Every structure is written in C-alpha cells, then in structure tokens.
Design an enzyme around this catalytic site. Structure first.
Site, PDB file in Angstrom:
ATOM      1  N   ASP A   1       1.157  -1.110   0.042  1.00 23.15           N
ATOM      2  CA  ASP A   1       0.002  -0.110   0.041  1.00 23.15           C
ATOM      3  C   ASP A   1       0.968   1.332   0.138  1.00 23.15           C
ATOM      4  O   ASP A   1       1.154   1.833   1.287  1.00 23.15           O
ATOM      5  CB  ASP A   1      -0.780  -0.072   1.339  1.00 23.15           C
ATOM      6  CG  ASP A   1      -1.851   0.935   1.112  1.00 23.15           C
ATOM      7  OD1 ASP A   1      -1.856   1.771   0.365  1.00 23.15           O
ATOM      8  OD2 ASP A   1      -2.826   0.937   1.936  1.00 23.15           O
ATOM      9  N   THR A   2       1.295   1.677  -1.206  1.00 18.96           N
ATOM     10  CA  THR A   2       2.215   2.917  -1.271  1.00 18.96           C
ATOM     11  C   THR A   2       1.342   4.267  -0.742  1.00 18.96           C
ATOM     12  O   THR A   2       2.190   5.178  -0.226  1.00 18.96           O
ATOM     13  CB  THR A   2       2.646   3.242  -2.704  1.00 18.96           C
ATOM     14  OG1 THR A   2       1.428   3.388  -3.535  1.00 18.96           O
ATOM     15  CG2 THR A   2       3.404   2.033  -3.147  1.00 18.96           C
ATOM     16  N   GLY A   3      -0.062   4.175  -0.584  1.00 16.87           N
ATOM     17  CA  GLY A   3      -0.668   5.388   0.105  1.00 16.87           C
ATOM     18  C   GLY A   3      -0.550   5.309   1.694  1.00 16.87           C
ATOM     19  O   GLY A   3      -1.399   6.149   2.319  1.00 16.87           O
TER      20      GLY A   3
HETATM   21  C1  LIG Z   1      -8.687  -0.826   2.021  1.00 17.28           C
HETATM   22  C2  LIG Z   1      -7.202  -0.556   2.076  1.00 17.28           C
HETATM   23  C3  LIG Z   1      -6.873   0.918   2.254  1.00 17.28           C
HETATM   24  C4  LIG Z   1      -7.074   1.361   3.614  1.00 17.28           C
HETATM   25  C5  LIG Z   1      -5.933   0.796   4.646  1.00 17.28           C
HETATM   26  C6  LIG Z   1      -7.493   1.756   1.276  1.00 17.28           C
HETATM   27  N1  LIG Z   1      -6.982   3.244   1.305  1.00 17.28           N
HETATM   28  C7  LIG Z   1      -5.934   3.449   0.559  1.00 17.28           C
HETATM   29  C8  LIG Z   1      -4.610   3.601   1.362  1.00 17.28           C
HETATM   30  O1  LIG Z   1      -3.573   3.890   0.827  1.00 17.28           O
HETATM   31  C9  LIG Z   1      -4.773   4.975   2.284  1.00 17.28           C
HETATM   32  C10 LIG Z   1      -4.804   6.259   1.635  1.00 17.28           C
HETATM   33  C11 LIG Z   1      -4.825   7.389   2.699  1.00 17.28           C
HETATM   34  C12 LIG Z   1      -3.508   8.297   2.866  1.00 17.28           C
HETATM   35  C13 LIG Z   1      -3.486   9.354   4.012  1.00 17.28           C
HETATM   36  C14 LIG Z   1      -4.756   9.816   4.365  1.00 17.28           C
HETATM   37  C15 LIG Z   1      -6.129   8.813   4.351  1.00 17.28           C
HETATM   38  C16 LIG Z   1      -6.059   8.057   3.291  1.00 17.28           C
HETATM   39  N2  LIG Z   1      -3.758   4.971   3.377  1.00 17.28           N
HETATM   40  C17 LIG Z   1      -4.130   4.734   4.693  1.00 17.28           C
HETATM   41  O2  LIG Z   1      -5.082   4.606   5.340  1.00 17.28           O
HETATM   42  O3  LIG Z   1      -2.831   4.872   5.463  1.00 17.28           O
HETATM   43  C18 LIG Z   1      -2.939   5.035   6.894  1.00 17.28           C
HETATM   44  C19 LIG Z   1      -1.779   3.939   7.306  1.00 17.28           C
HETATM   45  O4  LIG Z   1      -0.537   4.678   7.356  1.00 17.28           O
HETATM   46  C20 LIG Z   1      -0.850   6.114   7.068  1.00 17.28           C
HETATM   47  O5  LIG Z   1      -0.403   6.968   6.471  1.00 17.28           O
HETATM   48  C21 LIG Z   1      -1.653   7.341   5.710  1.00 17.28           C
HETATM   49  C22 LIG Z   1      -3.001   7.094   6.736  1.00 17.28           C
HETATM   50  C23 LIG Z   1      -2.577   6.197   7.447  1.00 17.28           C
HETATM   51  S1  LIG Z   1      -8.191   4.383   1.395  1.00 17.28           S
HETATM   52  O6  LIG Z   1      -7.710   5.775   1.447  1.00 17.28           O
HETATM   53  O7  LIG Z   1      -9.101   4.374   2.675  1.00 17.28           O
HETATM   54  C24 LIG Z   1      -9.483   4.134  -0.062  1.00 17.28           C
HETATM   55  C25 LIG Z   1      -8.911   4.738  -1.267  1.00 17.28           C
HETATM   56  C26 LIG Z   1      -9.894   4.357  -2.528  1.00 17.28           C
HETATM   57  C27 LIG Z   1     -11.388   3.520  -2.155  1.00 17.28           C
HETATM   58  C28 LIG Z   1     -12.198   2.982  -3.327  1.00 17.28           C
HETATM   59  O8  LIG Z   1     -11.537   2.040  -4.150  1.00 17.28           O
HETATM   60  C29 LIG Z   1     -11.618   2.856  -0.881  1.00 17.28           C
HETATM   61  C30 LIG Z   1     -10.576   3.292   0.318  1.00 17.28           C
END
Ligand SMILES: CCC(CC)CN(C[C@@H](O)[C@H](Cc1ccccc1)NC(=O)O[C@H]1CO[C@H]2OCC[C@H]21)S(=O)(=O)c1ccc(CO)cc1
EC number: 3.4.23.16
Lengths: 99, 99
Positions: free
Chosen positions: B25-27
């Site tokens: 998960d690069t995000g």
């Molecule tokens: C279901 C798997 C993921 C959640 C775990 C999905 N996410 C993408 C994820 O990359 C988010 C993207 C993201 C990035 C920053 C702020 C909110 C969401 N990152 C994230 O939640 O990381 C958290 C753990 O590390 C931290 O550093 C960032 C937040 C913390 S998401 O943003 O919630 C999401 C994106 C698109 C959809 C529709 O397909 C549904 C959910």
C-alpha cells in the site's frame, strides 16, 4: 520514472482543466479526489478505509493526466483528506511495484 | 519481483511466526494489521485514515518478512479493514514505483 518511497509518492495531475496533487496509491482500487464541481452526471457511493466510510460522487470516463501520462476512468469525488490515484488509473499509465 | 496492478498487490508475510496475507500500500505511511496476538511490548497509538481515526497497538522493531524480503520495523495492530504494508516497511525491502 522510478519513485522511491522515503516520502509520500505525490505527483501533479490534471483533471477537469485543473491541476492538483495526488498520491500514487497501490492500496486504492479506485481514484478518490477532493471536492471539485465536475460537470456531468454521477452516482452516489460509499467507500471505506481506516476510520470508516465517506460518501463520494462517482464519475465515469474522466480524463486524467498523471506526469504527462494520459488515462481515462472512474474518479470518486468527496471529502477525502488526501487525493489518491488508484489502481484503476495506475494500470493505465504503466505503473508497477518493484523490489 | 515486478508487480502489475490489475489486481490488488497482495502478498504473503511472516510475522510472529505465522503467515498472513497483506496489501502493498504505497498510500500508507505506516503498516497496519488486523487484530492478532504478537509477542512484544506495545504502546497505545492513534492513526487516521480516509474515514477518521482508530486506536492501535504500536509494536516497535518487529521482525516481518514480506514476499521473501526481511524487514524490522514498526507494526500497528488494530481494526483496519485489511492488512496493509506501508512505506515504513516498503522502503526496507527496496520497493519502488515505476512507470
Ligand atoms: C482498504 C485498504 C486501504 C486502507 C488501509 C484503502 N485506502 C488507501 C490507503 O493507501 C490510504 C490512503 C490514505 C492516505 C492518507 C490519509 C487517508 C487515506 N492510506 C491509509 O489509510 O494509511 C494509513 C496507514 O499509514 C498512514 O499513512 C496514511 C494514513 C494512514 S483508502 O484511502 O481508505 C481508500 C481509497 C480508494 C477506495 C475506493 O476504491 C476505498 C478506500
């Protein structure tokens, strides 16, 4: 190019004649962008992650340019704290993970 | 390996002696796993995602093998929707984005 992950993989995108910054996010199935009043029709959707769900507007066949790479696909618009380019568009620009 | 993104980038990880599946998960800045038993001291921590903030247990300096590549870093445990490997560990296994 090659993007290391020491910092957030943020890039400039062009959508709706506007430039924004977004994350190249392999963890997102679909692309989610901050509130912007795009033209055209849309379908309501709810998408979930850490913390729960947010309500978004689903637009289809939207043109997006990512680092000069053109793509067209679904964009979800809503009160997201972060703009994420998801796999639906990352595939279209030729993006892979490598290690 | 080189991993395309037409499907979710799911891989097998080993942590605490047990195999699990997790999403590259690069995000994600951080690595967050669903509830599990882990040998190690932990500290209460809060993390925020697309839908708000959750309570996690922070385990520092945990051994974890990701798709055959060893890492030692922080692992957060809590009610995430899915196991995600974030950038804190993706950097350790030498993961980059390429297009
Ligand atoms: C279901 C798997 C993921 C959640 C775990 C999905 N996410 C993408 C994820 O990359 C988010 C993207 C993201 C990035 C920053 C702020 C909110 C969401 N990152 C994230 O939640 O990381 C958290 C753990 O590390 C931290 O550093 C960032 C937040 C913390 S998401 O943003 O919630 C999401 C994106 C698109 C959809 C529709 O397909 C549904 C959910």
């Amino acid at each position: 190019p090659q993007i290391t992950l020491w910092k957030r993989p943020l890039v400039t995108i062009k959508i709706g004649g506007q430039l924004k910054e977004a994350l190249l996010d392999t963890g997102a199935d679909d692309t989610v962008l901050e509130e912007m009043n795009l033209p055209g029709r849309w379908k309501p959707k709810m998408i979930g992650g850490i913390g729960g769900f947010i309500k978004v507007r689903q637009y289809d066949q939207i043109l997006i340019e990512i680092c000069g790479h053109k793509a067209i696909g679904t964009v979800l618009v809503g009160p997201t704290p972060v703009n994420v380019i998801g796999r639906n568009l990352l595939t279209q620009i030729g993006c892979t993970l490598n290690f």
